[PDB]
Amino acid sequence: NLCPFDEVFNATRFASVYAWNRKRISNCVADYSVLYNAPFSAFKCYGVSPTKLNDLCFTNVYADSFVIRGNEVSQIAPGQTGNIADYNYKLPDDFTGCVIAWNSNKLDSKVGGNYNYLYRLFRKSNLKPFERDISTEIYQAGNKPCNGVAGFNCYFPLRSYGFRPTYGVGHQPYRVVVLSFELLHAPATVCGSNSE
Amino acid sequence: DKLWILQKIYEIMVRLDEEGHGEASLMVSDLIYEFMKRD
């Protein structure tokens, strides 16, 4: 049983980062050298190494995916702070897996702006690792309660990226896949293609 | 104080986007994040 990584990496539409998607991968064999060898702008593994992956077996693999700005890709790493790591998608200090990204300007930019991809600009506190906040409450920035209406110091919490193809590369959309490799006290049924 | 300029920075972010300066709007978005992280 081949693992459905193509359905993660070559999916037609990606999620907004604040509402990032998670896919559980299980009971299958995956060739990870096929991954490391599409054109990727980021590929960093933390508790593992790509060549070593093709011989390991895991209980589950979780594939989280979303779109962010090129300059924000660096925040998808353990120990990072910033608008994306604080308020949208947070990795733990002890992350075990890989962070993979690529430029998706051809797919996700549109003349006049693609407003389908959002991020969260305001939040009272930072996310916990792998927490997902999809609320759309008006953010109270000032002293007066907002009562559900945007206004002076009362801000709708999400913004659209508005990706356009003429943007600089640091402002262009990037598709990101975060692979979590889970090893519980349980049968390890997701196996590299050179597994014993 | 801090609240007045935060509001004017928010308004410039929105106006930049409505007037076709989306890239500039994103840069002002980054300033709003950094500004609000301060005490």
Numbering used by the authors:
A (entry chain B): 334 to 370, 372 to 530
B (entry chain A): 1 to 39
What is the paper's account of this structure, in its own sentences?
The spike protein of the SARS-CoV-2 binds to human angiotensin-converting enzyme 2 (ACE2) through the receptor-binding domain (RBD) and changes the conformation to fuse the viral and cell membranes, mediating viral entry. Here, we used a structure-guided strategy to engineer an inhibitor peptide with mutation-tolerant and potent binding ability against all SARS-CoV-2 variants. We named the peptide CeSPIACE (COVID-19 eliminative Short-Peptide Inhibiting ACE2 binding). For engineering, we determined approximately 2 Å-resolution crystal structures of CeSPIACE or its intermediate-stage peptides complexed with the RBDs of several strains, including WT, Alpha, Delta, BA.2, BA.5, or XBB.1.5.
The high-resolution structures identified the roles of the peptide residues and provided information on which residues to modify and how to modify them. CeSPIACE formed a two-helix bundle and homodimerized to form a four-helix bundle with the RBD-binding site facing outward; a similar dimer was reported by Khatri et al. We introduced notable interactions to form a rigid helix bundle; a salt bridge between R15-E19 to stabilize the helix, K2-D39 interactions at the edge to strengthen the helix bundle, and a cation–pi interaction between W4-R38 to maximize the dimer interface. Surface plasmon resonance (SPR) analyses showed that these interactions increased the RBD affinity despite not directly interacting with the RBD, presumably due to stabilizing the ready-to-bind structure. First, the main-chain structure of the ACE2-binding site is invariant to form the backbone of the binding site, though amino acid substitutions alter the side chain. Superimposition of the crystal structures confirmed that the RBD main chain of the binding interface was perfectly aligned, and the main-chain structures on RBD surfaces were invariant among various mutants. L3, Q7, E23, L26, and Y33 of CeSPIACE recognize the main-chain structure of RBD around A475-G476, N487, Y501-G502, Y495, and G416-N417, respectively, fitting into the groove between side chains. CeSPIACE was designed to interact with Y473, A475, N487, and Y489 via L3, L6, Q7, Y10, and M36; with R498 via G20; and with Y501 and G502 via G22, E23, and L26. The binding surface composing of G22 and L26 contributed to binding to both tyrosine and asparagine, whereas the previous A22 and M26 reduced the binding ability to Y501. M13 and V14 form a neutral and optimally sized pocket to accommodate both Q493 and cationic R493, which exist among Omicron subvariants. M27 improved accessibility to bulky residues Y505 and H505 by extending the side chain toward the dimer interface. The longer side chain of R493 contacts the binding surface comprising M13 and V14 more extensively than Q493, resulting in retention of the binding state.
